[PDB]
Amino acid sequence: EQTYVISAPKIFRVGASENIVIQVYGYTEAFDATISIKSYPDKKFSYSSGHVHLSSENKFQNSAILTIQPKQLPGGQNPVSYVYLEVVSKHFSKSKRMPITYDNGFLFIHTDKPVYTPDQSVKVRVYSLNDDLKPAKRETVLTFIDPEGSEVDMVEEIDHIGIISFPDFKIPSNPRYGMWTIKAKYKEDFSTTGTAYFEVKEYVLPHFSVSIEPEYNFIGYKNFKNFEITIKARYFYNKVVTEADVYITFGIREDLKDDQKEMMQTAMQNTMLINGIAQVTFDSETAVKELSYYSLEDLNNKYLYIAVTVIESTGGFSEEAEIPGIKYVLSPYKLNLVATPLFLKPGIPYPIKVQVKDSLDQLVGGVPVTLNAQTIDVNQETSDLDPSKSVTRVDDGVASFVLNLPSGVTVLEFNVKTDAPDLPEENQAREGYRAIAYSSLSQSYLYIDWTDNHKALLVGEHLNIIVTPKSPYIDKITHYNYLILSKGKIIHFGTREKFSDASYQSINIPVTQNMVPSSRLLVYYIVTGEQTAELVSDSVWLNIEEKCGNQLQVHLSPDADAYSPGQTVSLNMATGMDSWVALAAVDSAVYGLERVFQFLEKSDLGCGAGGGLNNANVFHLAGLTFLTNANADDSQENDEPCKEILR
Amino acid sequence: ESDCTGSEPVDAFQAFSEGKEAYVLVRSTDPKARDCLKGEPAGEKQDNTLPVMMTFKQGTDWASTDWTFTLDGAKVTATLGQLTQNREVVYDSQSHHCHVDKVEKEVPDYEMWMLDAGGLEVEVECCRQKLEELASGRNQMYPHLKDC
Amino acid sequence: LQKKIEEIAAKYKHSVVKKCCYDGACVNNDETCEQRAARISLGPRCIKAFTECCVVASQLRANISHKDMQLGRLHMKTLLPVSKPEIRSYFPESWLWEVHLVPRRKQLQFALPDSLTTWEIQGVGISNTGICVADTVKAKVFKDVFLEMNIPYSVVRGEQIQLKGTVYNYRTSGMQFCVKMSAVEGICTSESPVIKSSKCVRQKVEGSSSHLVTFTVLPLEIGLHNINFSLETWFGKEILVKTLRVVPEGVKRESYSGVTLDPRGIYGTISRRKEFPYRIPLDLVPKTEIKRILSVKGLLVGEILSAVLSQEGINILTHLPKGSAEAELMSVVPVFYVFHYLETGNHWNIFHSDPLIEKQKLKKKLKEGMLSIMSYRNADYSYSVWKGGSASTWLTAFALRVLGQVNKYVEQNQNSICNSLLWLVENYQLDNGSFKENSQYQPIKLQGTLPVEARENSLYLTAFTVIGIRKAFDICPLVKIDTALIKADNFLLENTLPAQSTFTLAISAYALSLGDKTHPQFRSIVSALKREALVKGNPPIYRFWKDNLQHKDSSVPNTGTARMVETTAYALLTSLNLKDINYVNPVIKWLSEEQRYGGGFYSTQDTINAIEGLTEYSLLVKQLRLSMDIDVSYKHKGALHNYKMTDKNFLGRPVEVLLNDDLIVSTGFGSGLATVHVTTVVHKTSTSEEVCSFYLKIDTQDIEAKRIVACASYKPSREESSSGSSHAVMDISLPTGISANEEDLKALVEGVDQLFTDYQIKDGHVILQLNSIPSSDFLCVRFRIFELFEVGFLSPATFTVYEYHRPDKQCTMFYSTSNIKIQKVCEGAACKCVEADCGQMQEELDLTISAETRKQTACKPEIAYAYKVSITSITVENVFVKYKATLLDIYKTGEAVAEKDSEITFIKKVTCTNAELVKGRQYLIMGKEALQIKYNFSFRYIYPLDSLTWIEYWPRDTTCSSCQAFLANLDEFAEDIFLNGC
Amino acid sequence: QCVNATCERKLDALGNAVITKCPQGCLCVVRGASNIVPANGTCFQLA
Ligand SMILES: *[C@@H]1O[C@H](CO)[C@@H](O[C@@H]2O[C@H](CO)[C@@H](O)[C@H](O)[C@H]2NC(C)=O)[C@H](O)[C@H]1NC(C)=O
């Protein structure tokens, strides 16, 4: 029995250097293989191709980087949607239809401020990277859309260094007020888009300053009957307003993005601003008995909008202030799983790592968690497990569980709750989950896990992964095989010798800079014999520290808590290697913003923490298509990448 | 075009806009016609006489001389000190924008005056026709074209 | 009370007409509900909702409590309106916005800006290894104790101003300090310099608070005067440099004189010299200089070139306010025509630097200017005169003209232009081909009865729309709108003659000139327009047009107006489109000389059409070489200066003419064609001799629960209907230290029952704009005012209203917000600043004056005049007092002479008490200078009474007891002065 | 002629707003807001 495995990204990206892996097994004599990206479906045109040699010197594994040139594709009316991935050798020739996307690179639009007043000039530049996170050097088009949806200005500029500086956008003397949108795009070849927003608001001279200070940023069960609100106000010449009239209206709000709100004309309580400070208490229950709701079980994740009008008594001048929304919180905690694929491997203990966070999404420690579970086996005979209890680790926020299930189990419906000593049963956090068993016709399963994930993986350390297969045919498996992916590209691949004198064996993986900020590992072994070869696979998601490849650091000499106006000061910039640096200096008061590392791993075509219903699903959830003479039974219409599931 | 018959009979005071406007000399058969000659009222209408200030230019120097006009219907007897000059407005445009004077001497000269503020072009052209008829081929001076 | 309003709000919560109910319920104690609804132009449903909520709100507001009123404004003010994007804080411009090549290490030093700001420095590195957002580093520029002073925009000379300021102490512990003021010569302070800047009186600010600062000053001299403020504390000393702008009394009036230099007489008669005479106006404010600026530019288009290329500003129509979209388009007019000249004629070598960068800059300014009007465009690609107002056929036509012309150099959105053109021809073109206006905007007032005025306005609007469509047709050359153009051209052809005004005749001639120039009726219209031509000279040196037809008005205007320049401009463009080159030269000379320093003219329309005429003519005729020796000198004074004008430099900076002599601009034999403009700025004390096109009245009142009420009414010209004025402007100058309540003004424009269409506060002026001011009755703006800082001897302010497109139809009136009289005396000290620069009467019958001190003061070389007079009449005019006196015996005459027993006028600032003169009494008066005015047909002399003016009471008889001896020595001096000749 | 063809504002292959082309004698106008995509316009005569 002889097998071959071709690993490629789930989708081909126009203009991207796509790395294609080939790994063959059973062959003892060396031979060459041609990997090719051709036109669909005729294969008349070869977009690219490469020759790879397979030998004992090569361990019968090789790699070839192909590229779909944008200029080699037609434009406009009947554009290309698919290409053919083809592998040809003396032994085999297999092809597959691969979808392509014209989304290549990243365009980050950076404006100096998020809010502008008339006659100001908007400073704007664009950071442009290609698929490989390198200066794209592609000419870029900026479009400006006013709040009424009109395209009012367009300007294109060539890119030399990856930083594209545009002429400043002058706000008209009497402009259209509201939300303006900036759209960056490439002039040729690609469909990549970038988008930023900036508001244009009319300046109005304020008479005095009004501040609202709620008791807390959230409303729990303890403050559902009383919520303290302190309203202060002072003149801009640093004197407290002596006497004023304070009017407070309350409303319920769905979300902060939508400017819609439901007022409550019952809680329009009025008080007096005396010597700068006034205070009121809002009985949430009574006021939200209006507009239905009635209970605290409702209003959860909804917001409390507050509006305040202050009428100073001497000059009669009036000034307004508002709190957009205070989220009503039903439970001080929120639960989420960490590094626990929702898939069962029959015979392997199944781990569940729950994680507890507060209303600020911060890891809360010492939180007891109770785990319940129901099991369904092949006979549909349900079984209610005995509940278990752990306590949240306070070094990493983790609450770990290990579960021993019968070998015949197929579905695990497990539910987790918090057990706080001071919380009622309603105010506890609860989350449900369902895990499905890996399906194998040879009762052959693989489970990988790397010692453990706390702390996160630091570039330069080493990842000591444990490969535990459970199956018949165990002591006829020759080797283990692995593929390491990051940012939508196969960065590594190889094979490790299987020790006949153990059940598990440690595979060591040096964590490199290519793996920042996240990676995915797929490990598989081949069950062979009669019938048809079978791939037994598993995958895990590796969260790695966000470390710059060329680290930038800026400092101010002299270092002081505060400076004086007009002071001559020196700024020191230090980078690991020769690097361009775009600087900005903005009045922080404008913020009352962007994070690139999270928007960057949208190129990861994988989803979830790893695993899969079967081998093909394991490859799919890792963002991979594969070509094999082995069993390739996948789900239906499984051509587009997976979509990360939300709850 | 049109018909150039205007203001009949001719009254000098009417031709002078009743002493409310200033007139400039644009054509004259007098070879010694003063450059940039402009006449403007220098006082109110007392009896049949009327003060008239005359501005003109000699070389690059501006000069002004005071005169007194004695109006009798269409005739005007201008005088300054001992110097006297007899004139008769022989034509006046319909809107009193321009008029043609006849000054009396051995060789009687003919002049064309018009509002310093300007006049209706058709009436100005009519006054020009009258002056060209009276001059009858004599050389005309243009005192307003002297860099005024 | 709550339910009685809950029903109202619930009735109009989701109503189609919801705002009309809202601003219907707004308080208006000056107009009934039906009077306010009489101005609503949005239909019957809006009128009925407005009227209902107005009446019900007025019934509920009877015998209310403040809490009930405010709660009602809470119910109404939340449910019906939506929202409006606005911000209460300003954020300074960002900086350090630069990119640097960092070789692993790079330090760069700079200076932090002058501000109290928490700056946030952010770095983003880009390399072959990707992107790296560095940690944002904070830098808080902060000052714990600091002084700031509030200096007003302007202050009238003589006013006693209280300058308010504040010292801020953000430290938690109080501290001692003292602020002192820097004494400048012209600024009179009550105290006196010690060593030379005020005195340090130690005060204490409490911790985490502030302390008030006040400095009373009295400016004695006009102009900008620097004043410093020192804040001293036991921890340092800070100096705050400031500038006080001192403005003369009375009104500013600005006259213009234009001269064209053609040394070789290429376009007409030779023109090498011109003399701008120095003439003092009648009611000139005493002790104020007559300002006048001289601008000599190189070409006919040179003034506009200097306006655009010199970036010290600049608006060519600063006297007209912003607010209308027409202003936003006029902002891009000059830049457009400059670009059109430079590109069509290829004159980019005028720049001594790189021409490509200059063409870049002008293209950018052209685009930025073109965006300014986007705000005034509606969703259906129509345009509104006023932001948020109804769409206007007129303004859409004009925007189509400017956009259509600009599209040649900065391509415009074709789809948008198409939708706008189709909005014009699909909705507001009638069957007869004419266009009708959608909004109530009246750009112009025309003559005739209501039907005749309707015909005239229809002709004008059709021609205007035709111009816009023709100017923007190539962007979207559709057959549908070409058919529309054919129908409209037919309407103009059939309905122009017989003409009703030279204005509509001219614009119709130009609109038809943009199409088929071979139609016989068009030629007839051109002939009728030529028939109305006025000429200066024969052969004509000038040719221009009066906007009234000859058969209706045979009088010739003495000065130009906006309609004159606009009609002349339309005729000029019509002739240029006909290639009638023999006919345009005097028109070009007249339009060029009617131009103004800055490039503009009288109003907006006349400006744009005249700029297009001058520019198109300059591109149509041969560009001559430019080389002149231009010498500007005074007649009886030194030579001012001279410069050689070439194609190298010809947009030279202006020059101020300070000396009081006649100006003379001359040039030798030269090549080229230059322009010489002089702008004279004077300040006058009266407005009586000016023609008033508006009845004005303005008062300040005390209100229940001070307020300015300013009313105007239009005075229709001959044959004008009683329908009212056109687009109008009510400019209310505020007195020094008086501030207007902006809420009242917002309430007068923001509503459906708006009385005014736009408002603004600029440089102490409350500028309101209006669609029309009525003729039948008065129209009043009412807005509350409060006293910002204390002002003594408050100088009166001005109230001006005028037609936006006819600034010559105006009326200016003085007014004061203070009632304050009497002015009996200043009592001792705290006095020297008021009585600083005016005369002090001698002691009555004072015998200690020693006859030689009376002669040495007379023989002083500083003292120009000195003689004895007898007062005949007293008069009080505005801010000054005039004394009519008889010149008896002349004792000295340094400058011009006055006749014996002739009438002589004296003037003193009304704010001077110790120079009180009694009618009928004789006085000996000696002083400096005088003013020579030409009144009626004769001279007149006016003498100010200031410091160093020696005046003394002089009885005629000798029954003053011991003053017999008095007059003895007095007549001793009087006898000795003329027999010597010192 | 050419009045009977259709025209509209669609997206490009690469995500650009584009106005289709009327026949060789007409021109296209997309009535309505400029941000509405896709939205059909009407074809128009030329002269
Ligand atoms: C107000 O303060 C300014 C700034 O200190 C003074 O201007 C300086 O004056 C000194 C002499 O007094 C000169 O040596 C400096 O060169 C000036 N600096 C500048 C920037 O002009 C000014 O003189 C002060 N005015 C008064 C009236 O005290």
Please provide residue A185's backbone torsions phi and psi, each rounded to the nearest 5 degrees: -160, 165
* Interstrand relation of A124-129 and A445-449 (parallel, antiparallel or unpaired): unpaired
Question: Distance of CA A644 to CAs A206, A516, A608, A647, Å?
Answer: 47, 20, 7, 10
How far is residue C764's CA from residue C728's CA, in Å, rounded to a whole number? Answer: 19
- Neighbours of A, requiring at least 3 CB pairs below 8 Å, are C, D
Of C655, C814, C662, nearest in space to C293 by CA: C655
Rg (CA), chain B: 14
Sequence-distant (≥ 6) Cβ neighbours of residue C14 within 8 angstroms: none
Mind telling me how many Å the CA of D41 is from chain C's nearest CA? 10
H or E segment to which residue C529 belongs: helix C520-531
CB B47 within 8 Å of CB B58: no
Of C525, C457, C453, nearest in space to C489 by CA: C525
C528: nearest CA in chain B?
B122
Mind telling me how many Å the CA of C937 is from chain B's nearest CA? 6
Length of chain B: 148
User: Is residue C300 exposed (0-12), middle (13-18) or buried (19+ Cβ within 10 Å)?
Assistant: buried
Of A214, A221, A218, A217, nearest in space to A285 by CA: A221
With the CA atoms of C964, C968, C971 and C975 taken in that order, what torsion angle do they form, in degrees rounded to the nearest 10? 160
Sequence-distant (≥ 6) Cβ neighbours of residue B72 within 8 angstroms: B48
Question: Distance of CA B115 to CAs A425, B112, C696, Å?
Answer: 105, 11, 35
Q: Which residue has the tokens 């060539």?
A: A158
B128 known ligand binder = no
Determine the distance separating the centroid of ligand 1 and the alpha carbon of C312, expressed in angstroms.
Answer: 25
Of C388, C338, C397, nearest in space to C363 by CA: C338
Please provide residue C200's backbone torsions phi and psi, each rounded to the nearest 5 degrees: -100, 105
Selecting from C272, C541, C544 the residue whose C-beta is nearest the C-beta of B144 gives C541
CATH dotted code for A106-200: 2.60.40.1930
Of C20, C33, C37, C22, nearest in space to C59 by CA: C33
Selecting from D31, D45, D46 the residue whose C-beta is nearest the C-beta of C419 gives D31
Distance of CA A498 to the CA centre of its chain: 35
Of A180, A196, A116, nearest in space to C92 by CA: A116
**At how many Å resolution was this determined?**
3.1
Determine the distance separating the centroid of ligand 1 and the alpha carbon of A103, expressed in angstroms.
Answer: 62
Task: Give C-chain residues touching D34 at CB under 8 angstroms.
Answer: 413, 415-416
Of ligand 1's atoms, which has the minimum distance to the CA of residue C197?
28
Question: Distance of CA C542 to CAs A359, A415, C250, C907, Å?
Answer: 84, 98, 36, 43
Of C157, C215, C219, C158, nearest in space to C188 by CA: C219
How far is residue A573's CA from residue C356's CA, in Å, rounded to a whole number? Answer: 36
CA atoms in the 13 A half-sphere facing the CB of C413: 18
How far is residue C598's CA from residue C961's CA, in Å, rounded to a whole number? Answer: 67
User: Is residue C131 exposed (0-12), middle (13-18) or buried (19+ Cβ within 10 Å)?
Assistant: buried
Tokens of residue C586, six digits: 């005097």
Please provide residue A55's backbone torsions phi and psi, each rounded to the nearest 5 degrees: -150, 175
Please provide residue A58's backbone torsions phi and psi, each rounded to the nearest 5 degrees: -90, -5
Q: Hey, are the CB atoms on D34 and A102 less than 8 Å from each other?
A: no
What is the full DSSP assignment across A191-240?
--EEEEEEEE-EE---SEEEEEEES-SEE-STTSS-EEEEEEEEETTTEE
CB B118 within 8 Å of CB C556: yes
What CATH architecture applies to the domain A3-101? Sandwich (2.60)
> Which residues precede gaps in chain A, with C-N > 2.5 A?
592
* Interstrand relation of C99-102 and A579-587 (parallel, antiparallel or unpaired): antiparallel
Sequence-distant (≥ 6) Cβ neighbours of residue A332 within 8 angstroms: A220, A358, A359, A420, A423, A427, A429
Of C226, C248, C250, C251, nearest in space to C239 by CA: C226
D9: nearest CA in chain C?
C415
Task: Give D-chain residues touching A185 at CB under 8 angstroms.
Answer: 15-16
CB A474 within 8 Å of CB A483: no
With the CA atoms of A622, A626, A631 and A634 taken in that order, what torsion angle do they form, in degrees rounded to the nearest 10? 50
How far is residue A279's CA from residue A273's CA, in Å, rounded to a whole number? Answer: 8
Contacts C–D by Cβ distance under 8 A = 30
Neighbours of B3 (CB within 10 A): 7
Structural domain span for residue B135? 1-148
What is the full DSSP assignment across C705-728?
--EEEEEEEE---TTB-TT--SSE
Of ligand 1's atoms, which has the minimum distance to the CA of residue C184?
27
Of A600, A476, A621, A617, nearest in space to A541 by CA: A621
| C226, C227, C239, C244: residue to mutate for ligand 1 pocket, most atoms within 8 A of CB | C226
* Interstrand relation of C145-150 and C223-233 (parallel, antiparallel or unpaired): unpaired
Neighbours of C496 (CB within 10 A): 25
In a 3-state reduction of DSSP, which class is residue A428? coil
Q: Which residue has the tokens 């430019």?
A: C626
CB A200 within 8 Å of CB A117: yes
Please provide residue B144's backbone torsions phi and psi, each rounded to the nearest 5 degrees: -85, -15
How far is residue C712's CA from residue C968's CA, in Å, rounded to a whole number? Answer: 60
Sequence-distant (≥ 6) Cβ neighbours of residue D15 within 8 angstroms: A185, A191, A193
Selecting from D19, D33, D47 the residue whose C-beta is nearest the C-beta of C379 gives D33
H or E segment to which residue C975 belongs: helix C963-978
How far is residue A491's CA from residue A511's CA, in Å, rounded to a whole number? Answer: 11
- Residue C822: asked if its preceding bond is cis (omega within 30°), the reply is yes
A459: left (phi over 0), alpha (psi -120 to 50) or beta: beta
Q: Hey, are the CB atoms on A193 and D33 less than 8 Å from each other?
A: no
Strand order in the sheet with C627-634: C273-276, C663-667, C627-634, C641-646
B101 known ligand binder = yes
CB A144 within 8 Å of CB A154: yes
* Interstrand relation of A169-170 and A121-122 (parallel, antiparallel or unpaired): antiparallel
Please provide residue C375's backbone torsions phi and psi, each rounded to the nearest 5 degrees: -65, -30
Distance of CA A605 to the CA centre of its chain: 11
Of C104, C138, C97, nearest in space to C120 by CA: C138
Q: What single letter denotes the amino acid at residue A241?
A: V
Tokens of residue C626, six digits: 């430019």
DSSP class of A74:
-
Mind telling me how many Å the CA of C54 is from chain D's nearest CA? 36
Mind telling me how many Å the CA of A509 is from chain C's nearest CA? 22
CA max distance for chain D? 34
Q: Hey, are the CB atoms on C415 and D47 less than 8 Å from each other?
A: no
How far is residue C659's CA from residue C290's CA, in Å, rounded to a whole number? Answer: 9
Bridge partners of D7? D41
How far is residue C630's CA from residue C673's CA, in Å, rounded to a whole number? Answer: 12
CB A428 within 8 Å of CB A331: yes
How far is residue A147's CA from residue A36's CA, in Å, rounded to a whole number? Answer: 48
With the CA atoms of C859, C861, C862 and C868 taken in that order, what torsion angle do they form, in degrees rounded to the nearest 10? 30
User: Is residue A283 exposed (0-12), middle (13-18) or buried (19+ Cβ within 10 Å)?
Assistant: middle
Determine the distance separating the centroid of ligand 1 and the alpha carbon of A613, expressed in angstroms.
Answer: 83
Please provide residue C338's backbone torsions phi and psi, each rounded to the nearest 5 degrees: -60, -45
CB C191 within 8 Å of CB C233: no
CB A383 within 8 Å of CB A414: no
Q: Which residue has the tokens 């608070």?
A: C209
Bridge partners of A436? A343, A411
CB A524 within 8 Å of CB A617: no
Q: What single letter denotes the amino acid at residue C409?
A: Y
- Taking chain D, what is the end-to-end CA distance rounded to the nearest angstrom? 12
| C195, C217, C241: residue to mutate for ligand 1 pocket, most atoms within 8 A of CB | C241
User: Is residue B36 exposed (0-12), middle (13-18) or buried (19+ Cβ within 10 Å)?
Assistant: middle
Q: Hey, are the CB atoms on A566 and C112 less than 8 Å from each other?
A: yes
How far is residue C241's CA from residue C226's CA, in Å, rounded to a whole number? Answer: 7
Task: Give A-chain residues touching C135 at CB under 8 angstroms.
Answer: 553-554
Sequence-distant (≥ 6) Cβ neighbours of residue C274 within 8 angstroms: C259, C261, C664, C665, C666, C676
How far is residue C483's CA from residue C669's CA, in Å, rounded to a whole number? Answer: 55
CA atoms in the 13 A half-sphere facing the CB of A239: 12
How far is residue C645's CA from residue A252's CA, in Å, rounded to a whole number? Answer: 74
Residue D1 contacts A, CB cutoff 8 Å: no
Task: Write out residues with Cβ below 6 Å of ligand 1.
Answer: C 182, 184, 226, 228, 239, 241
CB B43 within 8 Å of CB B124: no
Please provide residue C362's backbone torsions phi and psi, each rounded to the nearest 5 degrees: -65, -35
Distance of CA C256 to the CA centre of its chain: 15
Of C521, C626, C737, C765, nearest in space to C266 by CA: C626
Q: Write out the E strands in chain B.
A: 23-28, 35-41, 49-58, 61-72, 75-80, 83-92, 98-103, 109-115, 119-120
How far is residue C402's CA from residue C284's CA, in Å, rounded to a whole number? Answer: 42
Question: Distance of CA C116 to CAs B118, C150, C175, Å?
Answer: 64, 18, 21
Residue C528 contacts B, CB cutoff 8 Å: no
Selecting from A129, A570, A583 the residue whose C-beta is nearest the C-beta of C123 gives A583
Tokens of residue C339, six digits: 């670009």
A76: nearest CA in chain D?
D13
Whether A3-101 and A106-200 share one fold: the answer is yes
Encode C575-605: b = buried (16+ Cβ within 10 Å), e = exposed: bbbbeeeebbbbbbbbbbbbbbbbbbbbbbb
CATH dotted code for A208-328: 2.60.40.1940
CA max distance for chain C? 111
- Neighbours of B, requiring at least 3 CB pairs below 8 Å, are C
DSSP class of A148:
T
Question: Distance of CA C921 to CAs C56, C885, C955, Å?
Answer: 69, 9, 7
Of C211, C216, C212, nearest in space to C227 by CA: C216
Contacts A–C by Cβ distance under 8 A = 304
How far is residue C977's CA from residue A255's CA, in Å, rounded to a whole number? Answer: 96
Of ligand 1's atoms, which has the minimum distance to the CA of residue C227?
27
Residue C477 contacts D, CB cutoff 8 Å: yes
CB A71 within 8 Å of CB A61: no
How far is residue A235's CA from residue A245's CA, in Å, rounded to a whole number? Answer: 15
Tokens of residue A107, six digits: 């365009």
Selecting from C538, C544, C554 the residue whose C-beta is nearest the C-beta of B27 gives C538
Rg (CA), chain D: 11
Residue D18 contacts C, CB cutoff 8 Å: no
Tokens of residue C184, six digits: 């400048």
DSSP class of A51:
E
Of C789, C836, C706, nearest in space to C153 by CA: C789
CB A536 within 8 Å of CB A498: no
What is the full DSSP assignment across C68-114?
HHHHHHHHHHHHS-----EESS--PPPB---EEEESSEEEEEEE--S
Contacts A–D by Cβ distance under 8 A = 24
How far is residue A7's CA from residue C689's CA, in Å, rounded to a whole number? Answer: 97
How far is residue A183's CA from residue B29's CA, in Å, rounded to a whole number? Answer: 79
CATH number, residue B11 = 2.40.128.20
How far is residue C547's CA from residue C564's CA, in Å, rounded to a whole number? Answer: 6
Distance of CA A581 to the CA centre of its chain: 26
Encode A325-356: b = buried (16+ Cβ within 10 Å), e = exposed: bbbbbbbbbbbebbbbbbbbbbbbebebbbbb
User: Is residue A61 exposed (0-12), middle (13-18) or buried (19+ Cβ within 10 Å)?
Assistant: middle
Tokens of residue C353, six digits: 């630097």
Tokens of residue C555, six digits: 């009088």
Sequence-distant (≥ 6) Cβ neighbours of residue C341 within 8 angstroms: C301, C305, C347, C615, C618, C619
Of A453, A534, A446, A540, nearest in space to A498 by CA: A446
Of A114, A112, A109, nearest in space to A126 by CA: A109
| C196, C228, C230: residue to mutate for ligand 1 pocket, most atoms within 8 A of CB | C228
B5 known ligand binder = no
Q: Write out the E strands in A10-92.
A: 12-13, 17-25, 31-39, 46-54, 61-67, 82-89
Q: How many domains does chain B have?
A: 1
How far is residue C526's CA from residue C548's CA, in Å, rounded to a whole number? Answer: 16
B99 known ligand binder = yes
Sequence-distant (≥ 6) Cβ neighbours of residue A560 within 8 angstroms: none
Q: Which residue has the tokens 């001219």?
A: C506
Selecting from A77, A149, A189 the residue whose C-beta is nearest the C-beta of D34 gives A149
Encode C274-287: b = buried (16+ Cβ within 10 Å), e = exposed: bebeeeebebbbbb
